[PDB]
């Protein structure tokens, strides 16, 4: 477990935030990359804009963040700028969606979309499972999550770092539960599942969000959402990234054959022809679908559709020598 130090939080409730970012973090295809410096400032500033500033308890809560930070591995590509990029997309959807949710909500999905893949080590649940990597043994399913969330609360375990104090016991044991649910989601493998009930839910007609279960599901694809966000943004950046989820695919697949195994095409680094057809099977099978059903569920959110359609468009382009 890693702590942040004591002048790193104090000089981050310093931060204020300038006025051109205000008016475009606002935005779906909005892209935090070039702000670094600015990222736990602008959860923050998010956190504020969604669920109010005496709300949250602030020593707290810059505590929380930076420790969270110190958590992220570097790794290429599950690290601390996916984290602050799935929280911007969940940012977006609420702002977009606000009154649908509740307080708490607001308050643990932003929480929840930070941690989501704390402690990631840029290894797939498959490959700690078909091996062990004790991981694999206690959390039998969705295995990474797990752990993932374990961590979140870990890091709530430690001194000033449990901003969710001020909650009622009631409320507490909800907030930890809305993440639970919201980080497992964000097992990939659930995610297909879970589309095509909703699926048939919104065009049969059945979908209910008083329903504590239809809710459940709908905040499931949400979070599906975001994690992917990145094949929302302007094409050179969805295509920088796919970069740095590949470094760790093929990483992976050396370590894999390191071992005497022969990893699939995706993370095999002698099989980067494929890729190309590998990601419009998965803009096709996984991504656009995503976005489709989401669109439907929550209107206000077709721009991040679009954009997903426009960067599926260019990986068809890749196909065709273009
Ligand atoms: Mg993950
Ligand atoms: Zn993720």
Redesign the pocket.
Same mark, same amino acid.
């Given at each position: 477990m890693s702590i942040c130090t004591s002048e790193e939080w104090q000089g981050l409730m310093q931060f204020t935030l300038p006025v051109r970012l205000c008016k475009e973090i606002e935005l779906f295809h909005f892209d935090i990359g070039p702000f670094e410096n600015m990222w736990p400032g602008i959860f923050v500033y998010m956190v504020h804009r969604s669920c109010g500033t005496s709300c949250f308890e602030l020593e707290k809560l810059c505590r929380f963040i930076m420790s969270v930070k110190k958590n992220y591995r570097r790794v290429p590509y599950?690290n601390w700028k !996916?984290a602050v990029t799935?929280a911007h997309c969940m940012y977006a959807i609420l702002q977009n969606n606000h009154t649908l949710f509740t307080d708490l909500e607001r308050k643990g999905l932003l929480i929840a979309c930070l941690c !989501? @893949?704390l402690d990631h080590r840029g290894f797939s649940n498959s490959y700690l499972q078909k091996f062990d990597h004790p991981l694999a043994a206690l959390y039998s399913t969705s295995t990474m999550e797990q752990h993932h969330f374990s961590q979140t609360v870990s890091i709530l375990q430690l001194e000033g770092h449990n901003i969710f104090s001020t909650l009622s016991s009631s409320e507490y044991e909800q907030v930890l539960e809305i993440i639970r649910k919201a980080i497992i989601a964000?097992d990939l493998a659930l995610y297909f599942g879970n589309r095509k009930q909703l699926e048939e839910m919104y065009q049969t007609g059945s979908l209910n969000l008083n329903n504590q279960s239809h809710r459940d599901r709908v905040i499931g694809l949400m979070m599906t959402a975001c @994690?992917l966000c990145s094949v929302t943004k302007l094409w050179p950046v969805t295509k920088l990234t796919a970069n740095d989820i590949y470094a760790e695919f093929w990483a992976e697949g050396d370590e894999m054959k390191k071992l005497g195994i022969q990893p699939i095409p995706m993370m095999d680094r002698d099989k980067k022809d494929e890729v190309p057809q590998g990601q419009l099977g998965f803009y096709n099978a996984v991504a656009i679908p995503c976005y489709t059903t989401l669109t439907q569920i929550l209107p206000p959110t077709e721009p991040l559709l679009k954009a997903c359609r426009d960067n599926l468009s260019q990986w068809e382009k890749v196909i065709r020598g273009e």
């Open positions: 599950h !996916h799935v !989501h @893949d964000t @994690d």
